[PDB]
Amino acid sequence: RKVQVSYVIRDEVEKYNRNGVNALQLDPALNRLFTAGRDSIIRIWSVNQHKQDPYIASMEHHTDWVNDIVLCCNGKTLISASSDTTVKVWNAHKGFCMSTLRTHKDYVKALAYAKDKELVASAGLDRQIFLWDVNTLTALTASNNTVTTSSLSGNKDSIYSLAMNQLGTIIVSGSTEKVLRVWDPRTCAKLMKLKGHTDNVKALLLNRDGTQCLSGSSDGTIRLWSLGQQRCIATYRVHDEGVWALQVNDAFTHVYSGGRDRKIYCTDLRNPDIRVLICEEKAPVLKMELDRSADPPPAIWVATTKSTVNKWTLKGIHNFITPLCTQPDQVIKGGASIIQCHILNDKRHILTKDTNNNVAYWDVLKACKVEDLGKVDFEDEIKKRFKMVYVPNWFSVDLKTGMLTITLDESDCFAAWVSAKDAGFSSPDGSDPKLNLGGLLLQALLEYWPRTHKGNGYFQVPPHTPVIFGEAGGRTLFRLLCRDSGGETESMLLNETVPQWVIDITVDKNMPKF
Amino acid sequence: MQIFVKTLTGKTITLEVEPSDTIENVKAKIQDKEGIPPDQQRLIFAGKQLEDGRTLSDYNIQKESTLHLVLRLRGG
Amino acid sequence: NEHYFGLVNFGNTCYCNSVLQALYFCRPFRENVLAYKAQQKKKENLLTCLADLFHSIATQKKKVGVIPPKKFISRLRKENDLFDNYMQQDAHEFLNYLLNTIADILQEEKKQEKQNKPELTWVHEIFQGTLTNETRCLNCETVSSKDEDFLDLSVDVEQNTSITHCLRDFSNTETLCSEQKYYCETCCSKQEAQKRMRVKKLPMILALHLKRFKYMEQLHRYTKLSYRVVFPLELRLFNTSSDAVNLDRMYDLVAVVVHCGSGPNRGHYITIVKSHGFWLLFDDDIVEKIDAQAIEEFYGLTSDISKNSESGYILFYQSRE
Numbered sequence: 063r064k065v066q067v068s069y070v071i072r073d074e075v076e077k078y079n080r081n082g083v084n085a086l087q088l089d090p091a092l093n094r095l096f097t098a099g100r101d102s103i104i105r106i107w108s109v110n111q112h113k114q115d116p117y118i119a120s121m122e123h124h125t126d127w128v129n130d131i132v133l134c135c136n137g138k139t140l141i142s143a144s145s146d147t148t149v150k151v152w153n154a155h156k157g158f159c160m161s162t163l164r165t166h167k168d169y170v171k172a173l174a175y176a177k178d179k180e181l182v183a184s185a186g187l188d189r190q191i192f193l194w195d196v197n198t199l200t201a202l203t204a205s206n207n208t209v210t211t212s213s214l215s216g217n218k219d220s221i222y223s224l225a226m227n228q229l230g231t232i233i234v235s236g237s238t239e240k241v242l243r244v245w246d247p248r249t250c251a252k253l254m255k256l257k258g259h260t261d262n263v264k265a266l267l268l269n270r271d272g273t274q275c276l277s278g279s280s281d282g283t284i285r286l287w288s289l290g291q292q293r294c295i296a297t298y299r300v301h302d303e304g305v306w307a308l309q310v311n312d313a314f315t316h317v318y319s320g321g322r323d324r325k326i327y328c329t330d331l332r333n334p335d336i337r338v339l340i341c342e343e344k345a346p347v348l349k350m351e352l353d354r355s356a357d358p359p360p361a362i363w364v365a366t367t368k369s370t371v372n373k374w375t376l377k378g379i380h381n382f383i384t385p386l387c388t389q390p391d392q393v394i395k396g397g398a399s400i401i402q403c404h405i406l407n408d409k410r411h412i413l414t415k416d417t418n419n420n421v422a423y424w425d426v427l428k429a430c431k432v433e434d435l436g437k438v439d440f441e442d443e444i445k446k447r448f449k450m451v452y453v454p455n456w457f458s459v460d461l462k463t464g465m466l467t468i469t470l471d472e473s474d475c476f477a478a479w480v481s482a483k484d485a486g487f488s489s490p491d492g493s494d495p496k497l498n499l500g501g502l503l504l505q506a507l508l509e510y511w512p513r514t515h516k517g518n519g520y521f522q523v524p525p526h527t528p529v530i531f532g533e534a535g536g537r538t539l540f541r542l543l544c545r546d547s548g549g550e551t552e553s554m555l556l557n558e559t560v561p562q563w564v565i566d567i568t569v570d571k572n573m574p575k576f
Numbered sequence: 577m578q579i580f581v582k583t584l585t586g587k588t589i590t591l592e593v594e595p596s597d598t599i600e601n602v603k604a605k606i607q608d609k610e611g612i613p614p615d616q617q618r619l620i621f622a623g624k625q626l627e628d629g630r631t632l633s634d635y636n637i638q639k640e641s642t643l644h645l646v647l648r649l650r651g652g
Numbered sequence: 653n654e655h656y657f658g659l660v661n662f663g664n665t666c667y668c669n670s671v672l673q674a675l676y677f678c679r680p681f682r683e684n685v686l687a688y689k690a691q692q693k694k695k696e697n698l699l700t701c702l703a704d705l706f707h708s709i710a711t712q713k714k715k716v717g718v719i720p721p722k723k724f725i726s727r728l729r730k731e732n733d734l735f736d737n738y739m740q741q742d743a744h745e746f747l748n749y750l751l752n753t754i755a756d757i758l759q760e761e762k763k764q765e766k767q768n769k770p771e772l773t774w775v776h777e778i779f780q781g782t783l784t785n786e787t788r789c790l791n792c793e794t795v796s797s798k799d800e801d802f803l804d805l806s807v808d809v810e811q812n813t814s815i816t817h818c819l820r821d822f823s824n825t826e827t828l829c830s831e832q833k834y835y836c837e838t839c840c841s842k843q844e845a846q847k848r849m850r851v852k853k854l855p856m857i858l859a860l861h862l863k864r865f866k867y868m869e870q871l872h873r874y875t876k877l878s879y880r881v882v883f884p885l886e887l888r889l890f891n892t893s894s895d896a897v898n899l900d901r902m903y904d905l906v907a908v909v910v911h912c913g914s915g916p917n918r919g920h921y922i923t924i925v926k927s928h929g930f931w932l933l934f935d936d937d938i939v940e941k942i943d944a945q946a947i948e949e950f951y952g953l954t955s956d957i958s959k960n961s962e963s964g965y966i967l968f969y970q971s972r973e
């Protein structure tokens with residue numbers, strides 16, 4: 063497959079989430095919160111409340127959305143699943159990536175964990191489930207590992223949810239196939255199919271024994287299934303829209319639910335008529351995590367489309383549709399996500415509208431924000447900043463992370479030649495030559511690579527710029543900061559990943575013909 | 577902008593077009609995914625077989641538009 | 653007062669003759685054309701030639717005969733260099749050209765009276781319909797509807813099926829996944845989606861085009877699909893729309909444009925039309941009656957044992973007036 067160079071216009075440290083959180087994780091041992099963001103960055107927060115700055119650090123390695131995060135090995139070790147088709151093994155205490163399991167062939171949507179067996183499951187859109195031993199993934203000893211992958215077979219459609227009981231004797235998958243498939247993870251053999259749902263299962267929950275299962279579908283129904291009976295024992299219709307997130311009390315007699323309708327409800331499973339409304343969020347609920355410090359749970363952490371993570375106090379359920387909450391007690395801040403983007407007639411500048419309706423002017427080539435225009439009309443501004451020039455397209459933009467990501471592809475990268483004077487690069491008193499924008503940039507990106515030795519000789523790209531090399535399909539090859547190209551190990555990596563089309567103009571410096 | 581093409585088997589494929597893109601250039605993008613040479617392709621939209629010279633903007637083809645890919649059946 | 657007339661083939665012009673036959677047996681079209689003839693603009697365009705031709709057929713002394721459509725064909729060659737040749741062409745391509753060409757003539761005529769928001773021509777009143785493409789992003793679950801007009805429907809075809817089943821899966825919810833992921837504007841990423849095309853507004857005449865071709869990506873050539881694909885004499889079509897009013901229109905097979913030949917690069921086009929209860933076949937100049945059972949039973953093909961496989965290509969379904 064063909065390789066594409068990509069970079070991200072952002073600041074070295076992106077402290078706050080910039081696209082909403084797909085999954086949450088709470089460490090009871092250290093009172094820490096893990097937020098798997100759609101900005102491809104996992105972050106650590108302190109939940110002691112009485113801390114002005116809750117931010118601890120951020121785990122940056124992923125390239126697309128982090129869909130799920132499983133925290134294991136009694137304290138810290140984090141397993142992540144992402145739309146970047148990989149599963150990453152992290153030492154959660156220090157916050158660094160150990161291994162990248164490149165076994166999935168599509169977006170890895172969900173992870174499942176069985177504490178009593180140090181077993182972790184992974185599933186995604188590629189209709190395949192893989193079982194992993196955490197103690198094997200974390201082991202550094204390498205004693206005749208002969209690392210053979212273990213997979214479950216059955217799924218006829220893209221998997222959106224996974225769940226495993228604490229003992230690791232039951233595993234259930236949720237997909238667009240509507241029906242939920244079950245296996246014995248220990249023996250890998252099939253168990254049952256559970257027909258009942260008229261839509262997608264995005265939320266799956268199991269008790270300790272695994273004798274019963276809770277499911278939240280996009281059809282709006284919560285279902286309690288009896289595994290020993292192989293049938294649905296209770297159907298709960300609470301939300302007006304689909305249900306995406308689920309959380310249960312230690313007993314397994316109350317279900318905490320959230321969906322597209324932004325409402326969060328704790329419903330008594332035993333008798334559904336006793337349904338309590340926690341609150342209504344400002345964005346649809348993606349995933350939830352309970353404060354399991356005491357029974358009943360005293361708080362609940364809510365992840366939504368919005369980059370701000372809220373903690374709502376449950377304390378009042380025993381005393382108390384009017385909600386129990388109006389304002390959260392603890393709030394993790396969130397930065398703006400670029401929702402709209404326009405490339406102007408000069409293929410150098412970009413206009414963007416963030417979630418806060420602020421409009422910004424950007425320089426693609428010099429990889430930076432040139433101006434802040436504030437809360438103005440974006441549509442009118444595009445028309446107001448019209449340029450009477452023809453420059454062919456040479457780059458791609460993607461706001462999947464909420465941050466600006468530019469993609470240089472072989473097919474059109476060297477398509478745009480502009481005059482040095484017309485490009486702003488005033489050179490007195492040398493006549494303005496025709497410069498190839500793509501080339502000039504590629505040079506500025508791999509400026510610190512010894513193989514290329516100085517730079518483009520006109521402008522400089524911020525030295526903290528993430529420079530990613532990956533296949534058009536999805537698989538990333540290598541990732542590094544612009545300034546890190548100089549290091550031995552990085553320079554070696556560049557030599558094994560940088561494609562020939564890039565090498566032709568960066569090292570060989572054979573500038574294309576008009 | 578992304579438009580759809582209903583292939584010869586009914587399978588829908590996505591295309592990453594621009595309104596400025598010519599009909600012959602749309603065909604080339606289809607060739608990459610399907611393998612069909614443009615000379616052999618025929619695209620129907622809004623009951624109109626799209627002319628090679630024209631662009632998508634001309635035919636008012638916007639995001640989410642479904643082009644119907646079809647071939648010839650020469651007869652005398 | 654019925655006129656069953658053949659049409660002379662002037663060197664691989666069957667693709668053209670066969671469409672004219674089918675169009676002549678679509679009474680709203682024929683009546684409309686004949687009416688256009690009457691005004692007599694007298695400026696030679698493809699529409700005037702068509703009307704002059706349809707007029708000869710309609711106002712002939714004998715009920716059965718043969719007409720050389722030289723005049724029309726001359727204009728078709730003058731008006732289109734891709735048809736200005738003795739090469740064999742596609743009937744559907746001709747139909748599309750002819751219908752849009754004569755709609756565009758009318759679109760101009762409609763505008764020239766206003767001279768001394770858009771308007772729909774009588775070509776559209778007869779063959780136009782409207783679809784609604786709904787696209788549900790599977791991540792945010794926001795549904796995006798989009799209306800798109802149609803003059804005919806190019807249906808996919810499967811081995812040992814019916815025109816109804818093909819119409820059924822044409823309107824079925826397909827999943828956009830893997831390499832075909834949908835770009836969701838609210839998600840700002842590519843996500844799996846459900847795509848469904850349902851009928852919003854029914855055409856007075858449903859023109860069905862069967863995608864009877866298979867491309868061989870490796871062999872670098874395409875084949876003709878001569879599958880047994882059955883077509884009913886009647887079609888039940890129901891309406892989606894506003895849901896304030898609902899339509900359950902019953903259609904009737906008026907004409908079938910059929911392509912004879914084992915391959916897609918060469919062949920012969922004929923038309924079978926239903927006129928006054930009984931069916932009749934038009935092979936250029938030759939016009940002969942055919943028994944109802946011998947119609948559908950010969951337009952498919954079982955296994956391979958059927959010489960130069962005659963297959964149904966364009967189907968004309970007329971509303972019950």
Ligand SMILES: [Zn+2]
Binds near residue numbers: 791838
């Ligand atoms: Zn979406």
